[PDB]
Amino acid sequence: GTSKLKYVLQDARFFLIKSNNHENVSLAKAKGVWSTLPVNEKKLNLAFRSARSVILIFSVRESGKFQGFARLSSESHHGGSPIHWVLLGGVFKIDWICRRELPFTKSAHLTNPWNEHKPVKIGRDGQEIELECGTQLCLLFPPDESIDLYQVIHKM
């Protein structure tokens, strides 16, 4: 179904995350963590306190696809277990909502008002995606039947 997914996305904020390599997205999927440059870290921390859900939508540069999306479960924190990223501030904990890919060809009808109404695939790392565009983008992904959103809902 899509009902719990819609509930998680209600009144959420959405951010485009652009990664330079598949290995970092794979690490994030395995460990439930992300880290970004300080300008974006400050924005995401502000958003995490401001909204019921902050959703990161991931795309590896040059892949022509999104690789999934996740919800922040924490502000950024330093001093934890090191992460061997392929090369940065603190580490955000994230709960994956979908680990399936979506090709850009499927999102060509979605424009992002916060980036001059360019197609939603277009944007620098950290670009905020307006609510309606972000909700519809997340709903385009194939359902990920390995994930149970009951636990995600209980963190809101």
The rounded Cα 6 to chain-centroid distance in angstroms is: 15
Q: Check the annotation: does 85 bind a ligand.
A: yes
CA distance 93 to 129: 20
Q: Are 110 and 120 in contact (CB under 8 A)?
A: yes
Closest to 56 measured CA to CA, from 4, 128, 150: 128
Q: Check the annotation: does 125 bind a ligand.
A: yes
Task: Kindly report the length of the chain.
Answer: 156
Q: Are 97 and 140 in contact (CB under 8 A)?
A: no
CA distance 80 to 60: 25
Q: Which domains does the chain carry?
A: 1-156 (3.10.590.10)
CA atoms 90, 103, 5, 96: torsion sign: negative
**What was the elucidation method?**
X-ray
CA distance 42 to 77: 12
Q: Check the annotation: does 19 bind a ligand.
A: yes
CA distance 71 to 57: 9
CA distance 97 to 155: 13
Q: Check the annotation: does 11 bind a ligand.
A: no
Which residues, other chains included, contact 81 with Cβ-Cβ below 8 Å and sequence gap of 6+? none
Q: Check the annotation: does 20 bind a ligand.
A: yes
Q: Give 125: exposed, middle or buried? Use CB within 10 Å, 0-12, 13-18, 19+.
A: middle
User: Which value in Å is the resolution of this experimental model?
Assistant: 1.5
